[PDB]
Design an enzyme around this catalytic site. Structure first.
Site, mmCIF file in Angstrom:
data_model
loop_
_atom_site.group_PDB
_atom_site.id
_atom_site.type_symbol
_atom_site.label_atom_id
_atom_site.label_comp_id
_atom_site.label_asym_id
_atom_site.label_seq_id
_atom_site.Cartn_x
_atom_site.Cartn_y
_atom_site.Cartn_z
ATOM 1 N N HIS A 76 4.370 11.067 6.035
ATOM 2 C CA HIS A 76 3.952 10.753 7.405
ATOM 3 C C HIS A 76 5.128 10.153 8.154
ATOM 4 C CE1 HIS A 76 -0.514 10.420 6.028
ATOM 5 N NE2 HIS A 76 -0.121 11.675 6.213
ATOM 6 N N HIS A 96 2.053 9.118 0.826
ATOM 7 C CA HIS A 96 0.868 8.870 0.008
ATOM 8 C C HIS A 96 0.983 9.817 -1.177
ATOM 9 C CE1 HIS A 96 -1.119 6.828 3.438
ATOM 10 N NE2 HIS A 96 -0.379 7.678 4.139
ATOM 11 N N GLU A 108 -3.392 13.438 1.615
ATOM 12 C CA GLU A 108 -4.536 12.949 2.420
ATOM 13 C C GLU A 108 -5.206 14.161 3.081
ATOM 14 O OE1 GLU A 108 -3.041 9.340 4.563
ATOM 15 O OE2 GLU A 108 -4.204 8.469 3.017
ATOM 16 N N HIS A 123 6.547 7.090 5.691
ATOM 17 C CA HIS A 123 6.058 6.660 4.392
ATOM 18 C C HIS A 123 5.362 7.844 3.763
ATOM 19 C CE1 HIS A 123 2.650 6.155 7.153
ATOM 20 N NE2 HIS A 123 1.946 6.597 6.119
ATOM 21 N N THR A 174 -4.832 6.524 8.775
ATOM 22 C CA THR A 174 -5.565 6.774 7.535
ATOM 23 C C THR A 174 -5.689 5.526 6.673
ATOM 24 O OG1 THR A 174 -3.606 7.430 6.276
ATOM 25 C CG2 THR A 174 -4.760 9.190 7.494
ATOM 26 N N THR A 175 -5.123 4.403 7.092
ATOM 27 C CA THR A 175 -5.376 3.113 6.462
ATOM 28 C C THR A 175 -5.932 2.166 7.509
ATOM 29 O OG1 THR A 175 -3.153 2.264 6.952
ATOM 30 C CG2 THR A 175 -3.475 3.318 4.818
ATOM 31 N N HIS A 187 0.797 -1.225 0.000
ATOM 32 C CA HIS A 187 0.000 0.000 0.000
ATOM 33 C C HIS A 187 0.824 1.267 0.000
ATOM 34 C CE1 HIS A 187 0.198 -0.496 4.507
ATOM 35 N NE2 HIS A 187 -0.013 -1.753 4.166
HETATM 36 N N1 LIG Z 1 -1.227 6.642 7.247
HETATM 37 S S1 LIG Z 1 -0.884 6.840 8.846
HETATM 38 O O1 LIG Z 1 -2.168 7.375 9.481
HETATM 39 O O2 LIG Z 1 0.404 7.711 9.102
HETATM 40 C C1 LIG Z 1 -0.441 5.235 9.553
HETATM 41 C C2 LIG Z 1 0.542 5.173 10.485
HETATM 42 C C3 LIG Z 1 0.862 3.964 11.029
HETATM 43 C C4 LIG Z 1 0.163 2.850 10.661
HETATM 44 C C5 LIG Z 1 -0.824 2.945 9.734
HETATM 45 N N2 LIG Z 1 -1.561 1.814 9.294
HETATM 46 C C6 LIG Z 1 -1.003 0.529 9.140
HETATM 47 O O3 LIG Z 1 0.120 0.294 9.320
HETATM 48 N N3 LIG Z 1 -1.884 -0.461 8.667
HETATM 49 C C7 LIG Z 1 -1.422 -1.813 8.452
HETATM 50 C C8 LIG Z 1 -1.471 -2.013 6.973
HETATM 51 C C9 LIG Z 1 -1.258 -3.449 6.511
HETATM 52 C C10 LIG Z 1 0.127 -3.908 6.929
HETATM 53 O O4 LIG Z 1 1.032 -3.366 6.018
HETATM 54 C C11 LIG Z 1 -1.139 4.142 9.204
HETATM 55 ZN ZN LIG Z 2 0.188 7.604 6.116
#
Ligand SMILES: NS(=O)(=O)c1cccc(NC(=O)NCCCCO)c1
Ligand SMILES: [Zn+2]
Ligand SMILES: NS(=O)(=O)c1cccc(NC(=O)NCCCCO)c1
EC number: 4.2.1.1
Length: 257
Positions: A116, A93, A103, A91, A195-196, A61
């Site tokens: 992020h 987006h 986002e 990471h 957000t995921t 993702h």
């Molecule tokens: N996108 S975010 O709100 O910065 C964020 C930060 C830390 C964890 C997440 N979400 C996840 O790791 N979800 C697990 C996704 C499937 C495993 O890769 C989102």
């Molecule tokens: Zn994120």
């Protein structure tokens, strides 16, 4: 599973993750005229000098640059936060087009991408505990616009060829995340969520006012990644962003007048 496609994207997530319709979901639109200046908000303290990056991973993702979070080596403090939060990973987006990808939005404006930097509250011992707590995470969000290149991003861009597909990882040591920050640490802050999926309501969001600029070639290289695994049909990793969610009973605070 969930994803960003037509049949498994953000509008479907609530079926497996009912909190998607919760009371503190992220991202949101930041209405700059409605955000309230809070003179009691402290300056952020970003202490990344001893950061230890370990690896970069395509998780299907996004891609995560992961850090050693077994000691207080790279920490975020101050601002709206009580206590010390440790950097675990960053990471991004991003979009298929320079006009979309972020986002959070600012007065409905979308940026080309959003960084992020994810941190967890050390009083909870580990990341998996922290995501179960309303004050478990602090995510520092930084907008990317397309213009001049960001030199500190280039080492990330150049390793992406080695993690093209889901499940691929590569060693990624000695990366300094201070090279991804803008000049100003002025910020907006609000309580929100991942957000995921699993969309847990555990995040103090800290979104910087000042975007960083990256070049068109840099973001083009993000768009060559794949959501799929190797040997599966190729689907470009683009538009891996959740749209703005209802603000509900929340007020966004600004650290600056
Ligand atoms: N996108 S975010 O709100 O910065 C964020 C930060 C830390 C964890 C997440 N979400 C996840 O790791 N979800 C697990 C996704 C499937 C495993 O890769 C989102
Ligand atoms: Zn994120
Ligand atoms: N977005 S979600 O509520 O987690 C969601 C929505 C629709 C389907 C799914 N998951 C699947 O279809 N998994 C089966 C994978 C078939 C791919 O060949 C998840």
């Amino acid at each position: 599973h969930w994803g960003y496609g037509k049949h498994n994207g953000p509008e479907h997530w609530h079926k497996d993750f009912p909190i998607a319709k919760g009371e503190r979901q992220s991202p949101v639109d930041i209405d700059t005229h409605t955000a309230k200046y809070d003179p009691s908000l402290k300056p952020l303290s970003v202490s990344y000098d001893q950061a230890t990056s370990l690896r970069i991973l395509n998780n299907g993702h996004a891609f995560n640059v992961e850090f050693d979070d077994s000691q207080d080596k790279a920490v975020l403090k101050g601002g709206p936060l009580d206590g010390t939060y440790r950097l675990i990973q960053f990471h991004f987006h991003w979009g298929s087009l320079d006009g979309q990808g972020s986002e959070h939005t600012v007065d409905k404006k979308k940026y080309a991408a959003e960084l992020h930097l994810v941190h967890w509250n050390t009083k909870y011992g580990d990341f998996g505990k922290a995501v179960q707590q309303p004050d478990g995470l602090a995510v520092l969000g930084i907008f990317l616009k397309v213009g001049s290149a960001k030199p500190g991003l280039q080492k990330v861009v150049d390793v992406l060829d080695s993690i093209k597909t889901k499940g691929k990882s590569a060693d990624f040591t000695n990366f300094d995340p201070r090279g991804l920050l803008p000049e100003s640490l002025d910020y907006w802050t609000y309580p929100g969520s991942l957000t995921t999926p699993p969309l847990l309501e555990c995040v103090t969001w800290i979104v910087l006012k000042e975007p960083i600029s990256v070049s068109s070639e840099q973001v083009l290289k993000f768009r060559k990644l794949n959501f799929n695994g190797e040997g599966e049909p190729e689907e470009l990793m683009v538009d891996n962003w959740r749209p703005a969610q209802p603000l509900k009973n929340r007020q966004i605070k600004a650290s600056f007048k």
